[PDB]
Write a protein that binds this ligand. Structure first.
Ligand SMILES: *[C@@H]1O[C@H](CO)[C@@H](O[C@@H]2O[C@H](CO)[C@@H](O)[C@H](O)[C@H]2NC(C)=O)[C@H](O)[C@H]1NC(C)=O
Ligand SMILES: *[C@@H]1O[C@H](CO)[C@@H](O)[C@H](O)[C@H]1NC(C)=O
Lengths: 183, 113, 106, 104, 118, 119, 118
C-alpha cells in the first residue's frame, strides 16, 4: 500500500523541477481516493474514478508539484497557459486522476515563499511530460546577451510568492497527478 | 448527506451591539491534510441576490466590510458581526463546503429593533 | 501569534528508560520539526516534519502527533544526550520555537 | 558526473556484495542501474533506484536516495557476471557512470 | 517494443551515417536517444531526438558532429557523424525511455560495430 | 466587473418543461465551474448540480435526478438548465452561481429567476 | 563541506551600530532563506527575521523592528545583521540560519556572542 508517501509528503517539489515516483509490484487499495472527499478538484479523466478496486494496474506514476491557485485548471488535457505550456504539459491521451487541494498552512510565508519557481520564458513550447531544468539566460532581444542579465536579458525562472494573506487565486495548491495506463 | 441546523432562527437586535448566530452539522468538517476547516456564510437582502460574506472558517472576503468575523472549527460555528448597522437587513445562510451534496442550512432573519 | 507549550521543560530520567516530552500548540498548525542545541555550542537539525530523522541521529528518537498535539518519544535515554531539544512549527506565520526541554539525569 | 568505487570486483557465489555510485550534485532519486553481458546490450535492472523492473528476480534490492546510491545483489549465481552502470535523468546532459565488473 | 540497428565500416577521412529501427509502438511520441561505448571509458550521452518535429538536444562535446534526424513514416531513426577522428572507433546504441518524459532507459538495441582506424 | 445576467420570470403549465438560462460576462468563460441553487420559501436553499465549461462533467444531487438536466454552451458564453415535468412544488427561485476551480464556495451570483406553476 | 561561518565575538560600547558578518560556503547562496535568531543565556531561543538573497526582501519580528536592519551581498556570498541602538539587555549570541524547506533550518553558524560593555 504505497499511496502514503506521495500525498502526504512533506515538501512537494517546484513546478519546473516536478517530482515523480513509480508505483509497481503491489496492488493498490484506492480508498484514500473518492472516499475521504478531502480533495477539491478531482477531475479523473479516462477511467471513471469509483471502479478502481476491481481493476489492477502495473507501473503507474505519481508525479506531483505545487502551483498557484488560479492555475490549477491548467493541469488538464490541451489547456494553454503559463504553466501548462512552459512547465508541465499534459498530453491529449491522458488517463488518470488530477487531484488537487488547498494547502495554505504548509506552503506559504509571511513575505513571499520564493522557493517555488516557474519558467516564465522559453524558446518554444513543451512536449508532453518534457521537463526543463536548465537556467540559461533568455536574451529576449536580438542582441546576444551572454549571461549579463540586463536589458532584454531576463533570468527565465521567475519566482512565485505565496503569502498567507492573499485571495483565492494566489495560493499554493499541491497538485498530484495520478497517471494510470494499461499494462 | 449532512443536515445543517441553525439554533437562532430569527434575530432582533438594536443598532450598535454584538450579534452572534450559529450553524451546526453532523460530520467534523475539517479534512486531515491541511487542517483548515470548511464552511461558508451568505447574505441575501430581500429582493436582491445573495452575496458571499465569509469563506472557509474565519476569512472575510475582499469587498465585504470588516465587521463580519467568522469562527468555528469542526461541527459548531458562529458568525459574528461586531457592530450591527442599518444595512444589515437580510438573512444569513450557513453552507456546507466539505463534501457532496452541498446541503445549505436554514435562514436567520435579522430585523433591527 | 502561535504560542507553544513544551510542558516537560525539566525532565529527570535515568538512562536506558522510555520517557517522552510533549509540545502543546495553539491555533491550527501543520508539522513540527525539531532541533537539538547542545549546551554552549551550535544547534543541530534533529528531526524532520514528524518522524523523518534527518540522517544524523540514533534510531531511538521518533516523535509522533498530528493536528494540534505533538510529542517526542525516546525509547532509551543516554548520558550522551544531556542536550536541549527545540521545536519549530510549519505554518504560514513566522516560526516560533518552544520553551525548552532540559533532558537531565538523576 | 558520476563516479564508482571499484573498477573491478571479486566476490564469490555464496557471499553478498554492494555496488555504490556517488553523484556530483543532488539528484532526487533519479538514477538507474544496468547489467551488460559482454556480448549483448545492457538491460534495465533497477529503475528509480528502489523499484524493480520486470524480468528481474527479487535478488536485486536496490536502494539509496539523495546523493549516494547502492545496488545490492544478494546471492549471486553463475550467470550474474556482467557490467554494472549508473545514470541520472534530470540535468542535461545525461551523464553516466564508470563500468564496474563483478568477477570471482 | 524492441529496437533494431545495423552495422557499418567507414574510412578515417569519410563520413558515417548510422540507423535505428523502432517497432511495436507509436514512434512519434517518445524520445529516441543515442549513447556511445568505447572499449572501457564507461558510456557518454550523445543526444536525443523527438520524431514529432525534430526538436533535438545535444551535448557540447558532440555538438557539430552528431546530426540527429528521423522520419515519422518509416518509424526509423538515424544519426550522422562527420569529420571522423581516431576516438570515434566504438560501438553505438539507440535506446528509449519507459514512459513519456522523465524515466529510466528500458528498450535498448543491438550493437553497431564501427571501426575508423585505418 | 463579474456579471451574471438572468431572465426576469417564467410562467409554465403543470406538465411541461422549461429552459432556464443565465449569461456569464466579465471573465473568461472556460475556467470556473457553474452551480445552480434552488430557493423555495420556508425550506431554505438546496444544491442542484454543476457543470464544467471546458469538459462537461456534470454531477447532480440525489433528490434531483431525472428532473433537472444541466447543459453548458461555450458559444455566446451562456449557461443553461433544463427542468422537466414540473409539479406543484416548483414555484421557487433558481439562481446561477460560479466557482469551482479551487473551492466550492460561491462568490458571484445571479439576481434570481421566479418560477410559477398554475393555470 | 557545506557550512556557514560568521565573524568573531565582539564586546563594544552601548548605542553604536554594530555589524555581524556571515559567510556562505558550499551551497548555492542565492536560493536559501537566511534566518537569524537570538539566544539569551539561560533562556529559550527566539526569532529575529530573515532575508532572501535573490531579491533582498526582509521581514522582521515586531519586537525587533528598529533594533536591526538586515543586509546581504548577492555577489560576495555574505550576510549582515546591522544592529542598531545597542542596550545592556542585548547581551546574547545571535546565530545565522540558512534554510529552504519551510520552517526547518538546515545549517547554522559559529555563534557570535555579542556582550555589552560599560
Ligand atoms: C496521510 O495519508 C494517509 C493516506 O494516504 C492517511 O491514512 C488514512 O487517513 C484517513 C484520514 O485521516 C484515516 O481515517 C485513516 O485511518 C488513515 N489510514 C491509515 C492507514 O492510517 C493518513 O492518516 C494521513 N496522515 C495525516 C497527515 O493525516
Ligand atoms: C492563538 O492563535 C490565535 C489565532 O492566531 C490567536 O488569535 C491567539 O491570540 C493565539 N494565542 C495567543 C495567546 O497567542
Amino acid at each position: 500500500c504505497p499511496f502514503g508517501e506521495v500525498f502526504n509528503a512533506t515538501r512537494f517539489a517546484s513546478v519546473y523541477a516536478w517530482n515523480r515516483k513509480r508505483i509497481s509490484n503491489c496492488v493498490a487499495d484506492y480508498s484514500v481516493l473518492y472516499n475521504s472527499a478531502s480533495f477539491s478538484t478531482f477531475k479523473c479523466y479516462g477511467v471513471s474514478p469509483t471502479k478502481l478496486n476491481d481493476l489492477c494496474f502495473t507501473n503507474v506514476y505519481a508525479d506531483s508539484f505545487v502551483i498557484r491557485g488560479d492555475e490549477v485548471r491548467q493541469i488538464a488535457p490541451g489547456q494553454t497557459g503559463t504553466i501548462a505550456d512552459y512547465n508541465y504539459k499534459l498530453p491529449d491521451d491522458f488517463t488518470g486522476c488530477v487531484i488537487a487541494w488547498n494547502s495554505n498552512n504548509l506552503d506559504s510565508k509571511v513575505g513571499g515563499n520564493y522557493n517555488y519557481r516557474y519558467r516564465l520564458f522559453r524558446k518554444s513550447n513543451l512536449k508532453p511530460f518534457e521537463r526543463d531544468i536548465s537556467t540559461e539566460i533568455y536574451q529576449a532581444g536580438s542582441k546576444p546577451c551572454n549571461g549579463v542579465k540586463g536589458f532584454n536579458c531576463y533570468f527565465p525562472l521567475q519566482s512565485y510568492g505565496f503569502q498567507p494573506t492573499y485571495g483565492v487565486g494566489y495560493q499554493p495548491y499541491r497538485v498530484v497527478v495520478l497517471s494510470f495506463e494499461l499494462l | 448527506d449532512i443536515v445543517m441546523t441553525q439554533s437562532p432562527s430569527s434575530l432582533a437586535m438594536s443598532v450598535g451591539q454584538k450579534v452572534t448566530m450559529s450553524c451546526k452539522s453532523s460530520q467534523s468538517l475539517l479534512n486531515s491534510y491541511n487542517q483548515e476547516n470548511y464552511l461558508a456564510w451568505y447574505q441575501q437582502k430581500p429582493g436582491q441576490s445573495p452575496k458571499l460574506l465569509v469563506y472557509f472558517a474565519s476569512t472575510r472576503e475582499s469587498g465585504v466590510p470588516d465587521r463580519f468575523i467568522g469562527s468555528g472549527s469542526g461541527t459548531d460555528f458562529t458568525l459574528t458581526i461586531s457592530s450591527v448597522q442599518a444595512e444589515d437587513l437580510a438573512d444569513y445562510f450557513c453552507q456546507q463546503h466539505y463534501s457532496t451534496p452541498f446541503t445549505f442550512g436554514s435562514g436567520t432573519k435579522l430585523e433591527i429593533k | 501569534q502561535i504560542v507553544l507549550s513544551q510542558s516537560p521543560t525539566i525532565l529527570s530520567a535515568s538512562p536506558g528508560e522510555k520517557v517522552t516530552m510533549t509540545c502543546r500548540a495553539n491555533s491550527s498548525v501543520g508539522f513540527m520539526h525539531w532541533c537539538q542545541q547542545k549546551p554552549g555550542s551550535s544547534p543541530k537539525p534533529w528531526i524532520y516534519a514528524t518522524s523523518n530523522l534527518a540522517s544524523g541521529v540514533p534510531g531511538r528518537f521518533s516523535g509522533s502527533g498530528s493536528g494540534t498535539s505533538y510529542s517526542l518519544t525516546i525509547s532509551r535515554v543516554e548520558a550522551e544526550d544531556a542536550a536541549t531539544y527545540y521545536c519549530q512549527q510549519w505554518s504560514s506565520d513566522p516560526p516560533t520555537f518552544g520553551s525548552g526541554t532540559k533532558l537531565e539525569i538523576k | 558526473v558520476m563516479t564508482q568505487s571499484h573498477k573491478f570486483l571479486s566476490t564469490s557465489v555464496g557471499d553478498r556484495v554492494n555496488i555504490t555510485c556517488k553523484a556530483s550534485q543532488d539528484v532526487d532519486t533519479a538514477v538507474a542501474w544496468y547489467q551488460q553481458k559482454p556480448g549483448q546490450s545492457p538491460k534495465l535492472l533497477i529503475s528509480w533506484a528502489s523499484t524493480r523492473h520486470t524480468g528481474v528476480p527479487d535478488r536485486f534490492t536496490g536502494s539509496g536516495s539523495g546523493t549516494d546510491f547502492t545496488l545490492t545483489i544478494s546471492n549471486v549465481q553463475s550467470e550474474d557476471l556482467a557490467d554494472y552502470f549508473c545514470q541520472q535523468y534530470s540535468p542535461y546532459p545525461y551523464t553516466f557512470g564508470g563500468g564496474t565488473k563483478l568477477e570471482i | 517494443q524492441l529496437a533494431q540497428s545495423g552495422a557499418e565500416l567507414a574510412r578515417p577521412g569519410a563520413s558515417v551515417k548510422l540507423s535505428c529501427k523502432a517497432s511495436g509502438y507509436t514512434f512519434t511520441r517518445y524520445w529516441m536517444q543515442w549513447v556511445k561505448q568505447r572499449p572501457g571509458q564507461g558510456l557518454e550521452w550523445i543526444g536525443a531526438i523527438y520524431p514529432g518535429d525534430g526538436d533535438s538536444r545535444y551535448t557540447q562535446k558532440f555538438k557539430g558532429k552528431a546530426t540527429l534526424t528521423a522520419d515519422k513514416s518509416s518509424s526509423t531513426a538515424y544519426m550522422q557523424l562527420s569529420s571522423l577522428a581516431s576516438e570515434d572507433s566504438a560501438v553505438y546504441y539507440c535506446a528509449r525511455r519507459n514512459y513519456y518524459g522523465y524515466d529510466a532507459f528500458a528498450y535498448w538495441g543491438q550493437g553497431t560495430l564501427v571501426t575508423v582506424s585505418a | 466587473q463579474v456579471q451574471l445576467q438572468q431572465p426576469g420570470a417564467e410562467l409554465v403549465r403543470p406538465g411541461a418543461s422549461v429552459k432556464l438560462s443565465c449569461k456569464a460576462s466579465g471573465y473568461t468563460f472556460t475556467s470556473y465551474w457553474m452551480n445552480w441553487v434552488k430557493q423555495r420559501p420556508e425550506q431554505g436553499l438546496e444544491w442542484i448540480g454543476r457543470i464544467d465549461p471546458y469538459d462537461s462533467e456534470t454531477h447532480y444531487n440525489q433528490k434531483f435526478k431525472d428532473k433537472a438536466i444541466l447543459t453548458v454552451d461555450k458559444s455566446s458564453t451562456t449557461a443553461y438548465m433544463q427542468l422537466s415535468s414540473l409539479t406543484s412544488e416548483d414555484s421557487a427561485v433558481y439562481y446561477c452561481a460560479r466557482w469551482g476551480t479551487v473551492e466550492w464556495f460561491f462568490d458571484y451570483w445571479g439576481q434570481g429567476t421566479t418560477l410559477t406553476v398554475s393555470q | 563541506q557545506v557550512q556557514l561561518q560568521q565573524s568573531g565575538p565582539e564586546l563594544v560600547k552601548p548605542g553604536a551600530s554594530v555589524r555581524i558578518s556571515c559567510k556562505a560556503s558550499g551551497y548555492t547562496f542565492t536560493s536559501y532563506y537566511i534566518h537569524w535568531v537570538k539566544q539569551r543565556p539561560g533562556q529559550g531561543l527566539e526569532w529575529i527575521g530573515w532575508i532572501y538573497p535573490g531579491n533582498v526582501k526582509s521581514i522582521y519580528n515586531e519586537k525587533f523592528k528598529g533594533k536591526a536592519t538586515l543586509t546581504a551581498d548577492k555577489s560576495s556570498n555574505t550576510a549582515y545583521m546591522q544592529l542598531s541602538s545597542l542596550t545592556s539587555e542585548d547581551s546574547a549570541v545571535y546565530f545565522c540560519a540558512g534554510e529552504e524547506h519551510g520552517n526547518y533550518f538546515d545549517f547554522w553558524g559559529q555563534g557570535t556572542t555579542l556582550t555589552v560593555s560599560q
